[PDB]
Design a protein around this nucleic acid. Structure first.
Lengths: 488, 69, 65, 169, 182, 263, 265
RNA sequence: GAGAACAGAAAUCUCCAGUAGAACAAAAGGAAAAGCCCCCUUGAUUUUGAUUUUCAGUGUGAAUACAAACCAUGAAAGU
RNA sequence: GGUUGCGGCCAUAUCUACCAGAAAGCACCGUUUCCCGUCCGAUCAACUGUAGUUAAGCUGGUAGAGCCUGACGAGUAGUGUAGGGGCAUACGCGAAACUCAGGUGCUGCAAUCU
C-alpha cells in the first residue's frame, strides 16, 4: 500500500496557524453585472453587491414573471461557473435548474443468484424503476423486482442468446431480441411468449428501436424496429407481428438504429455509411451520410432519452387514457427538442477511428463538427438528457465530455483503468455512471468533472449498466453471472 | 521453491484516491536548474501520463480494406 | 522490471539482482489494470521467469495470478 | 381452584452404567437405540478413581433422553415388570422419581445373546406449566414456591394412575 | 440570529485538540455566584467562543475520498470530514520512553564481525526420503523426525536427543537470564 | 495465555499513548452528593472509566503509596478520589501518575449551588465523542495553578488525538471560566465549569458558509474551589515532555520525489 | 448471611434476561480514534403475537428514540393475519425503515455538506443465530426499506449450507408468505381439525396462497405511500388513567398503622 | 442434601447455591466469561516514513521502530 | 398510575414465608410444510392468536438479614511541627467504632391501557 508523502514540518506549521474566515458579513463589493440566457436569450442590468447567490437567483424570477429556479453561470478563458464574486464586470447567465435532483448512488447491495450466464443487456422500465429486466448468455430473460431484489417470471421460449432486451416506452410489451434469428414479445405479467415470435431474419439482431409514444396515435400500439447483421432493418407491427416493409440499403451489418422524434430512423452500419430511413416515407432513404473513416459503431440523439420514457417522467405517475399520454409525451418532446427555440434533435455518430461526428439530419449533409480527441475506439456515445452535454466511452480507459451544440471539448475522465463499455445518464444529468472491463463501477460529477465515488463488488467484466428513470436505484450486470443493484 | 500464501498474493496495490493526487501533482510539478532530483519515486506513471493531448492519429484504414483488396 | 524478491540456489544471486531463470520478480502490471476486491486497483504482481535469458536475447515470465 | 396447575410429565431419562468400556459400551448403545430409538450419546467419567479400574474419560455410561409420548409407554412397560410398585424413596425433593431393574430383555426385548444380560435404570422429571420461564433465554424468571412439585404430590399423582403403590407399607 | 462575533484581544485557538483560549477581561461584577445574570452572561460568552472556534475550525481543509464502505476499516465518501492540524498543546506524558534495548553479546559480536543479519527467508526447509518440504520448525518439523523414525542404527538413543535439545533450550534460557542483567 | 501478554503489552510504555485511563476511588466520606458528582463525571469520561468496588480510607496527602499501587495494578494514569472533610466541605481530589509514580495533587471542591445533569433539560448525548473546550481569562495561561488545572482538564477530556474529525461529532462544548479577574497575590477565584450542548441555527444572517451557533446548558454546573496543591519537580516535568524523535537542503517534494537545492 | 452481605447482584437490566451488557460494551467501546462519527443502534425484539423494532442511538440520558414501529400497527395497511410470521417481520422492518427515512426528510448541523445516507447496525438480542430466523427477515425488510445496514446473506432463508450460494426465489416466496401459503394448501388437503382450529381467521376471510401474496404487496405499497404513523385516539386521558389504576394497585400502608400493629404484638 | 439395578464413601442421574478454592497462567485493593463444549484458521505477507552495514554504498540486501493494506471471524459492531 | 422495547447508578434494586393483580400489555400456552440443531420440535428454529390461563413469570402489599443516607462522637484519637525539661503545652491534616433519626427505589424517550 503506497503512502502519500506526509506533510513536512512547514506544512504542519502552516496548518497550525489560523487563517481567513468565511463569515463575510461586512463590506460587500459591488460590480456591474449583466444577465443573458445561456441558449439564445440575451438581456436586467444591475450593479449589486456581493449578495448571496439565492438573492441573485430570485431576482430574475420577477423579471420574467415565472413565479422557477434557473441554473446560473457567468463568463460563458475565465470559464468561471461571494466566493465566485470575490475572484475579480461579470456577465451572468441562467438556465432551468430542473429542481428534481437524483441523489448520488453510493451504497451497494447483495447479489442475486439468477440465470447462470454472462450478462449481455439490461434496461429499466419506464413506468417505474421497481421492475427491471436483464439479458444474459442464457436463452431465457428474467425480470427483477428492484424493491425486493428478487427474480420474476422467466421468459421461456428462446433457444439462443438474448442479445438485446429493453422495455417499450409505454411499458406494455417488452422486446427481447434473440441471437439466432428472432425477437419475442413479453408483457410485464405474461410469463410466457405473447404469440408467435418474430422470425424470418437471416442474421442475429444487433439492436432494437421502439416507436416513440409522441408519434404513436391513440389505440394503435407502437411499432418495433429491429436491426441485424444482415444489413437490413425490418419494421414490425406489435399487434399483427407482420412486417410492412424492409430496407436493405445498408451493404453491411447495421450497428444500431434509433427511431427519431421526426419519424426518421437514424441507423449506422459496418459499411461506413449512415442512411436516414423513415417510416413515413414507406421505407425509403431520404438522405445518406458518408464521413467516417472507419465504420459507425454507435448512434445517439439529443431527444433519444425523452423517447424511452414514454411520458413517464421522474414522478412515475401513469396516465389515464392514450390520448392524454400521447399529449404529455409530445409536450415533453417539444420541451427537450425545442431547447434552442426551434425543434432540432441533434445527432452524434460514434466512429471506431478514435473520432466522433456531430450530425444534423434535418439540415444539410455537411457535418456540424468533428469530435476527435480519443486514442481508442469509442464503444458508446450518448447525449445528455438535458442535451447541452455529450459524453463518450472508449477502450482507452478514459471518458470524454463534449459540448452539446458547438462541439468544443469540455473535459476527460481517467478513473477507469481498462476499456470503458457502455454508460448511463442520470435522470437529472447531474451524475454519469460508467462501467469498464475492470471490475469496478464509477460515477462522475458533471458539476466539476471529478470522481464522486467508486462502486466495486462485481467479479469481473461489468458489460453494461443502467440508471433508473426516477434515479432511486442503479442496476448493473457483468460476466460474473450475478446481478448487482446500487442505490443512494 | 516452496508453496505458500506468498507470490500469488497482492503486494503492490495502489490506492484509488491517491491516483488523483498523483495526477494533480504531475500536472502541477515544476522544477528549475537550481533544483535537482536525488530519488525518483516509483509510481504508475502510465496512468498519470497520457494527459488531454487530443490529436486522434489517423484511422486504421487497412482494417477497412486489406492490401490484397 | 520492478525488483527481484526471491532467487533460490544461494539467494546471494537475489542480492545481486541476476535473472537466473526460476527466479520470482516483480513487474509493473499497471498496463493490464486488474483490480482486486475493494476497488484498490492493482499495478504490480510477482512473476516467475519462464525462459532462459542466458541463452536468449529476450526475457519471458508468467504472472503469478 | 386448579385452573392451570395440572401435573404433566416433562421427560423420561434412561441410562445404563457399565463396569468397563469397549464392547459392553457398544452393547449399551445398541440397547438404547433399539429401546428408545434415540441416537446414542457418550457420558465420560469426570475423574480417575482406580477403585473400579475406570480411567479419566472412560466412557462408562450413555445418557439418553426419552422425551415424548413414547415415555409413557416405556414407563408403563417397565412398571409392569416391577410388580407395579415403587419404593417410598427414589423421589427427589422436587418429586422427580426413578427406579431400575435387571434383565431389561424381560419386557419384550429379544433374548438374543448379541446384547446379553443388561439391566437399566429410570429417572422421571415432573413439572407444571410455565417451566419455559426457567429455560427460556429472554426474561429468565424464578419459580414460585407453591408451583414447585413436592414428594407427596408426585407420589399421589403416580398412585392415581398406573395403579402403583409405595411398596413400603 | 446574527453570527458576527469579535473581541478586542485576538483569540487563541488550538484546532489540534478542539480547544481555544480567551484572555479577555472577566467581569467580576456579574460573574459573582450570587448574581442571577451570571448564568446568562456565561452562556453568551460560551456561545461567542464556540462560534469563533467553529468559524476558525471550519476553515481547515476537508478530505473527500472516492471509495465506498468496503471493509470495516474503510471510509464513506459521502461523509465529509475536517482535517485537523497537528496538536499544539504539549500535554504531559504518562510513561517514559522505553528507548532502552537489549545489550546481549550477540549484537556486539555482530557489530565486530562481518556477519550480516539473517534475512528470515522462511520456515520451509527441505528434507529427503519423504518427498515433502517438512519445514524445520512450526509443524512436525525435522526436530521430532529423529524421534519419530523407527531406526536409530548406531541404552535408548531416542531419549538422548530429546535430552540434548532440552539442555540446549536450558542453555538458551540461561543466556537470556545472563543478558537480562545488562 | 496470550490474553495476559496482550494486557502486559499495553502496560508497557508505548511510543503513541492511548486515551489516559481514569480510576475513580470513593473515599471514606463519599457523600451522596459526592456519589452523584462522581456519576456525572463518569458520564463524561466513558467508556474509559473505572470505579472501585467500595469505599476507601486513603489520604493522598497523608498516604501517596496506595495511589501508586492502585495505578500500577490497574494500569490507570489518571486517578480521582472524592473525599470531603468537616473543614473541606465537598472536597474532591485529582491526581496524575507518571510511570506509576505520583505526578501532582490538587484539591477541588464543588459549591452547594451545583446542578446535576438530571436537573437540566434532557438532550441527546453520545458517549465517546470528543467535546470542545473554551478557556476564558488570562489567568488560565498566566498562572501556575490555573495552567495546571487547564492541563488536567484537557488530559481528562481531550480524548483521542485523531487528526480527522467528523462534522457531526461536535455535539457539546465545555465552558471553562473563572469567577472574575484578580490582582497579583490575591486569592485564586473559583473555577467555573459548564457544559453546553450545540444547536445549529440556520445561517440566514451568516449566508451559507457558517450557521448561527446556539447553546443549551446541560450541566453539571460546578464551581471548583482551590485547596491544597502539589507540583512535580522540574526533572519530572522534563521527563513527561519527552518526544519520540520521529536534513539540510533535503525535502520530499510532491509525489515522493527527493529533491534538493544547489545554491 | 455472610454470602448476602459480601456480594453484589448483577445490573438491574442484567438480572432479568432483558439486555446483554456484553453486546452493549462492544457497541459502545468503539476505540474510536478515527472519527467522531455518531451511531444508531438497531433494536429488534419478538414478543408473543407482536414484533417490536426500533432504532435507538446510545445515550446516557436513556437512549432517546428517534423512530420506532410495532407489528400491531400493520392493520393500518390491512394486514392482520400472521402478525408474528416471517412476512410480518419483513413488513415491520420495511415500515420502520420507510418511516425513519420519511421523518428524517431525505426524500419524498451538516451545513454545506451533501446528502449523507443513514447507517444502522443490527443488535444480537437474545435469539440464537441461525439462518432463516425472523430477526434476519426483519433486518432484510429494514434494509429493503432504505437502510444500508452491513449484512451478509449467509443467514437469509434459502441459503445453501453445503455451498456459499442462495436461492432468491425462496427468499421472495418467504417475503410473500411462501411457507405459510404452502402450508395453507398442505393443511387444506390434509386433516381439517388442525386446519379448523389453526388458521381459523384464514378460513373466515377466505385467503388462499395468492390472495395472501397480493395482500402483502398491497400492504407494502401502502407502507411506501403513507408511513405517516397516525396513533390511536388516545382517549381516557393520563390523569383519569392514573386515578383508575390506583384503585386496584396496593399502595404502601401508612407507617403509623404498621407501628401500631407492631406495638400491639 | 433427596437421591438413582448391580454401583457401595469415590462409575450414573435431577432440583438449589458457591460472589463466584474452577481458572480468570498468576503474583494484586480484584462472566451470557478470560473456565468447558461445535466451525474456520495463517501469519516468518507485502512498500518504507527513525536506528547499522558492506564491498561495485548496491533506492534497501535485512530484523529491529512504526506506518496503511491483507486475513480470520460474524448477521454486525468488533478483536 | 399498569404493561412493553431501549436504557441512567447497578442490593433503597437482593434473599427468606405468605397474599393481590379487572381493563390494556408481557408471560404462560397450542402446533411442526419449510429455513434450522440438538439423542429428545424441552432450550433453540418455524407456524397459529385459534384451543387452554392468572396455575406460573413479572409488578405490588405484609415481617425477618442486610443495604443506603443525615447529625453523635467531633475538630475527638494520631501524628511533626518551638523552647520548661529529659513528657505536657504551643500547633496543621484528621479517622473509625459507638450513639440518635430516617427508606428498603427512583429515573427519560417511544408504544399501549381504563
Amino acid at each position: 500500500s503506497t503512502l502519500i508523502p506526509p506533510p513536512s514540518k512547514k506544512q504542519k506549521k502552516e496548518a497550525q496557524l489560523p487563517r481567513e474566515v468565511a463569515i463575510i458579513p461586512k463590506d460587500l463589493p459591488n460590480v456591474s453585472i449583466k444577465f443573458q440566457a445561456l441558449d439564445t436569450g440575451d438581456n436586467a442590468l444591475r450593479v449589486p453587491g456581493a449578495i448571496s447567490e439565492k438573492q441573485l437567483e430570485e431576482l430574475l424570477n420577477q423579471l420574467n414573471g415565472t413565479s422557477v429556479p434557473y441554473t446560473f453561470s457567468c463568463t460563458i478563458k475565465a470559464s468561471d461557473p461571494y466566493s465566485s464574486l470575490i475572484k475579480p464586470q461579470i456577465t451572468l447567465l441562467y438556465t432551468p435548474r430542473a429542481v428534481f435532483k437524483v441523489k448520488p448512488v453510493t451504497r451497494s447491495s447483495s447479489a442475486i443468484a439468477g440465470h447462470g450466464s454472462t450478462i449481455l443487456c439490461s434496461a429499466f422500465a419506464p413506468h417505474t424503476s421497481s421492475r427491471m429486466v436483464t439479458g444474459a448468455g442464457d436463452n431465457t430473460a428474467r425480470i427483477w423486482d428492484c424493491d425486493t431484489q428478487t427474480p420474476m417470471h422467466t421468459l421461456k421460449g428462446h433457444y439462443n442468446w438474448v442479445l438485446c432486451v429493453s422495455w417499450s416506452p409505454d411499458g406494455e410489451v417488452i422486446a427481447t431480441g434473440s441471437m439466432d434469428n428472432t425477437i419475442r414479445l413479453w408483457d410485464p405479467k405474461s410469463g410466457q411468449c405473447l404469440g408467435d415470435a418474430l422470425r424470418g431474419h437471416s442474421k442475429w439482431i444487433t439492436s432494437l428501436s421502439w416507436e416513440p409514444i409522441h408519434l404513436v396515435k391513440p389505440g394503435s400500439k407502437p411499432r418495433l424496429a429491429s436491426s441485424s447483421k444482415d444489413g437490413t432493418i425490418k419494421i414490425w407491427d406489435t399487434v399483427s407481428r407482420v412486417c410492412q416493409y424492409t430496407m436493405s440499403g445498408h451493404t453491411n451489418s447495421v450497428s444500431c438504429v434509433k427511431w427519431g422524434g421526426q419519424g426518421l430512423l437514424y441507423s449506422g452500419s459496418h459499411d461506413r455509411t449512415v442512411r436516414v430511413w423513415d417510416i413515413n416515407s414507406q421505407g425509403r432513404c431520404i438522405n445518406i451520410l458518408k464521413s467516417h473513416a472507419h465504420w459507425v459503431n454507435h448512434l445517439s440523439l439529443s431527444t433519444d432519452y425523452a423517447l424511452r420514457i414514454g411520458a413517464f417522467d421522474h414522478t412515475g405517475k401513469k396516465p389515464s387514457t392514450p390520448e392524454e399520454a400521447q399529449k404529455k409525451a409530445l409536450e415533453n418532446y417539444e420541451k427537450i427538442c425545442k431547447k434552442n427555440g426551434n425543434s432540432e434533435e441533434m445527432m452524434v455518430t460514434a466512429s471506431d477511428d478514435y473520432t466522433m461526428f456531430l450530425w444534423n439530419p434535418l439540415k444539410s449533409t455537411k457535418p456540424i463538427a468533428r469530435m476527435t480527441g480519443h486514442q481508442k475506439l469509442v464503444n458508446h456515445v450518448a447525449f445528455s438528457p438535458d442535451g447541452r452535454y455529450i459524453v463518450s466511452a472508449s477502450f482507452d480507459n478514459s471518458i470524454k465530455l463534449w459540448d452539446g451544440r458547438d462541439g468544443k471539448f469540455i473535459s476527460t475522465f481517467r478513473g477507469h483503468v481498462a476499456s470503458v463499455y457502455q454508460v448511463a445518464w442520470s435522470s437529472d444529468c447531474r451524475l454519469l455512471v460508467s462501467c469498464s472491463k475492470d471490475t469496478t463501477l464509477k460515477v462522475w460529477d458533471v458539476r466539476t468533472r471529478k470522481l464522486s465515488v467508486d462502486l466495486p463488488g462485481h467479479k469481473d467484466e461489468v458489460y453494461t449498466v443502467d440508471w433508473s428513470v426516477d434515479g432511486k436505484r442503479v442496476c448493473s450486470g457483468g460476466k460474473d453471472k450475478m446481478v448487482r443493484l446500487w442505490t443512494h | 521453491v516452496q508453496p505458500d500464501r506468498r507470490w500469488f498474493g497482492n503486494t503492490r496495490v495502489i490506492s484509488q484516491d491517491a491516483l488523483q493526487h498523483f495526477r494533480s501533482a504531475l500536472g502541477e510539478t515544476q522544477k528549475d536548474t537550481y533544483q535537482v532530483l536525488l530519488r525518483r519515486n516509483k509510481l504508475p506513471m502510465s496512468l498519470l501520463e497520457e494527459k488531454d493531448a487530443d490529436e486522434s492519429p489517423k484511422a486504421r484504414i487497412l482494417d477497412t480494406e486489406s492490401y490484397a483488396d | 522490471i520492478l525488483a527481484v524478491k526471491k532467487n533460490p540456489q544461494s539467494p546471494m544471486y537475489t542480492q545481486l539482482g541476476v535473472l537466473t531463470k526460476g527466479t520470482i520478480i516483480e513487474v509493473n502490471v499497471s498496463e493490464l489494470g486488474m483490480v482486486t476486491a475493494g476497488g484498490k486497483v492493482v499495478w504490480g504482481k510477482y512473476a516467475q521467469v519462464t525462459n532462459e535469458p542466458d541463452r536468449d536475447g529476450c526475457v519471458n515470465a508468467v504472472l503469478l495470478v | 381452584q386448579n385452573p392451570m396447575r395440572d401435573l404433566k410429565i416433562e421427560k423420561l431419562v434412561l441410562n445404563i452404567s457399565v463396569g468397563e468400556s469397549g464392547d459392553r459400551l457398544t452393547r449399551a448403545s445398541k440397547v438404547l437405540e433399539q429401546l428408545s430409538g434415540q441416537t446414542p450419546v457418550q457420558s465420560k467419567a469426570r475423574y480417575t478413581v482406580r477403585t473400579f479400574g475406570i480411567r479419566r474419560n472412560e466412557k462408562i455410561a450413555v445418557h439418553v433422553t426419552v422425551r415424548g409420548p413414547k415415555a409413557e409407554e416405556i414407563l408403563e412397560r417397565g412398571l409392569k415388570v416391577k410388580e407395579y410398585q415403587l419404593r417410598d424413596r427414589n423421589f427427589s425433593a422436587t418429586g422427580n422419581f426413578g427406579f431400575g431393574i435387571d434383565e431389561h430383555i424381560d419386557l419384550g426385548i429379544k433374548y438374543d445373546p448379541s446384547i446379553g444380560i443388561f439391566g437399566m435404570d429410570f429417572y422421571v422429571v415432573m413439572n407444571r406449566p410455565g417451566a419455559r420461564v426457567t429455560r427460556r433465554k429472554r426474561c429468565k424468571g424464578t419459580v414460585g414456591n407453591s408451583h414447585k412439585t413436592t414428594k407427596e404430590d408426585t407420589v399421589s399423582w403416580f398412585k392415581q394412575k398406573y395403579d402403583a403403590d409405595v411398596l413400603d407399607k | 440570529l446574527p453570527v458576527t462575533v469579535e473581541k478586542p484581544i485576538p483569540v487563541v485557538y488550538d484546532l489540534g485538540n478542539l480547544a481555544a483560549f480567551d484572555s479577555n477581561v472577566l467581569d467580576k461584577n456579574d460573574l459573582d455566584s450570587s448574581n442571577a445574570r451570571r448564568e446568562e452572561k456565561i452562556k453568551s460568552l460560551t456561545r461567542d467562543n464556540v462560534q469563533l472556534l467553529i468559524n476558525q475550525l471550519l476553515s481547515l481543509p476537508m478530505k473527500t475520498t472516492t471509495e465506498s464502505v468496503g471493509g470495516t476499516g474503510g471510509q464513506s465518501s459521502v461523509m465529509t470530514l475536517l482535517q485537523l492540524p497537528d496538536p499544539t498543546t504539549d500535554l504531559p506524558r504518562e510513561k517514559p520512553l522505553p528507548k532502552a534495548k537489549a545489550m546481549t553479546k550477540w549484537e556486539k559480536f555482530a557489530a565486530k564481525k562481518g556477519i550480516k543479519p539473517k534475512e528470515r527467508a522462511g520456515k520451509m526447509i527441505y528434507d529427503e526420503a519423504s518427498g515433502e518440504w517438512v519445514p524445520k520448525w512450526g509443524y512436525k518439523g525435522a526436530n521430532k523426525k529423529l524421534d519419530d523414525q523407527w531406526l536409530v542404527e548406531v541404552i535408548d538413543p531416542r531419549t538422548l536427543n530429546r535430552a540434548e535439545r532440552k539442555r540446549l533450550v536450558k542453555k538458551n534460557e540461561k543466556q537470556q537470564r545472563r543478558n537480562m542483567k545488562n | 495465555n496470550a490474553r495476559a501478554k496482550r494486557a502486559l503489552v499495553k502496560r508497557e510504555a508505548k511510543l503513541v499513548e492511548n486515551v489516559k485511563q481514569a480510576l475513580f476511588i470513593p473515599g471514606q466520606s463519599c457523600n451522596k452528593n459526592l456519589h452523584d458528582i462522581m456519576v456525572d463525571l463518569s458520564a463524561l469520561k466513558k467508556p474509559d472509566m473505572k470505579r472501585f468496588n467500595r469505599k476507601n480510607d486513603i489520604h493522598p496527602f497523608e498516604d501517596m503509596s496506595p495511589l501508586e499501587f492502585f495505578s500500577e495494578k490497574n494500569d490507570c494514569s489518571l486517578m480521582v478520589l472524592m473525599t470531603s472533610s468537616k473543614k473541606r466541605k465537598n472536597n474532591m481530589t485529582f491526581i496524575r501518575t507518571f510511570g506509576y509514580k505520583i505526578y501532582d495533587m490538587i484539591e477541588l471542591m464543588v459549591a452547594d449551588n451545583f446542578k446535576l445533569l438530571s436537573d437540566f433539560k434532557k438532550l441527546t448525548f453520545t458517549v465517546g465523542l470528543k467535546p470542545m473546550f473554551t478557556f476564558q481569562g488570562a489567568a488560565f495561561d498566566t498562572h501556575p495553578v490555573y495552567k495546571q488545572i487547564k492541563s488536567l482538564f484537557l488530559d481528562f477530556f481531550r480524548g483521542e488525538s485523531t487528526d480527522l474529525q467528523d462534522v457531526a461529532g461536535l455535539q457539546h462544548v465545555i465552558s471553562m471560566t473563572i469567577q472574575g479577574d484578580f490582582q497579583d497575590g490575591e486569592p485564586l477565584p473559583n473555577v467555573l465549569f459548564r457544559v453546553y450542548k450545540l444547536k445549529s441555527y440556520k445561517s440566514d444572517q451568516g449566508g451559507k458558509r457558517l450557521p448561527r451557533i446556539e447553546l443549551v446548558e446541560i450541566g453539571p454546573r460546578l464551581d471548583f474551589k482551590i485547596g491544597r496543591i502539589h507540583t512535580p519537580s522540574p526533572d519530572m516535568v522534563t521527563e513527561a515532555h519527552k518526544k519520540p524523535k520521529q536534513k539540510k537542503n533535503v525535502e520530499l517534494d510532491i509525489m515522493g520525489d527527493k529533491l534538493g537545492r544547489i545554491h | 448471611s455472610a454470602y448476602s452481605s459480601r456480594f453484589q447482584t448483577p445490573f438491574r437490566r442484567r438480572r432479568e434476561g432483558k439486555t446483554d451488557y456484553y453486546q452493549r460494551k462492544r457497541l459502545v467501546t468503539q476505540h474510536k480514534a478515527k472519527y467522531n462519527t455518531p451511531k444508531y443502534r438497531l433494536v429488534v425484539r419478538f414478543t408473543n403475537k407482536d414484533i417490536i423494532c426500533q432504532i435507538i442511538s446510545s445515550t446516557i440520558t436513556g437512549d432517546v428514540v428517534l423512530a420506532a414501529a410495532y407489528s400491531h400497527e400493520l392493520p393500518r395497511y390491512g394486514i392482520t393475519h400472521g402478525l408474528t410470521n416471517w412476512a410480518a417481520a419483513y413488513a415491520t422492518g420495511l415500515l420502520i425503515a420507510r418511516r425513519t427515512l420519511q421523518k428524517l426528510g431525505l426524500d419524498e448541523e451538516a451545513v454545506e455538506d451533501g446528502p449523507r445516507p443513514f447507517k444502522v447496525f443490527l443488535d444480537i438480542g437474545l435469539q440464537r443465530t441461525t439462518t432463516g430466523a425472523r430477526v434476519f427477515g426483519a433486518l432484510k425488510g429494514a434494509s429493503d426499506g432504505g437502510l444500508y445496514v452491513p449484512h451478509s446473506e449467509n443467514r437469509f432463508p434459502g441459503w445453501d449450507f453445503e455451498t456459499e450460494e442462495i436461492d432468491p426465489e425462496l427468499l421472495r416466496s418467504y417475503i410473500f408468505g411462501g411457507h405459510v401459503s404452502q402450508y395453507m394448501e398442505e393443511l387444506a388437503d390434509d386433516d381439517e381439525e388442525r386446519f379448523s382450529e389453526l388458521f381459523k381467521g384464514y378460513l373466515a376471510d377466505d385467503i388462499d396462497a395468492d390472495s395472501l401474496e397480493d395482500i402483502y404487496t398491497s400492504a407494502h405499497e401502502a407502507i411506501r405511500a403513507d408511513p405517516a404513523f397516525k396513533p390511536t385516539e388516545k382517549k381516557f386521558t393520563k390523569e383519569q388513567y392514573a386515578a383508575e389504576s390506583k384503585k386496584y394497585r396496593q399502595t404502601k400502608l401508612s407507617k403509623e398503622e404498621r407501628a401500631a400493629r407492631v406495638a400491639a404484638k
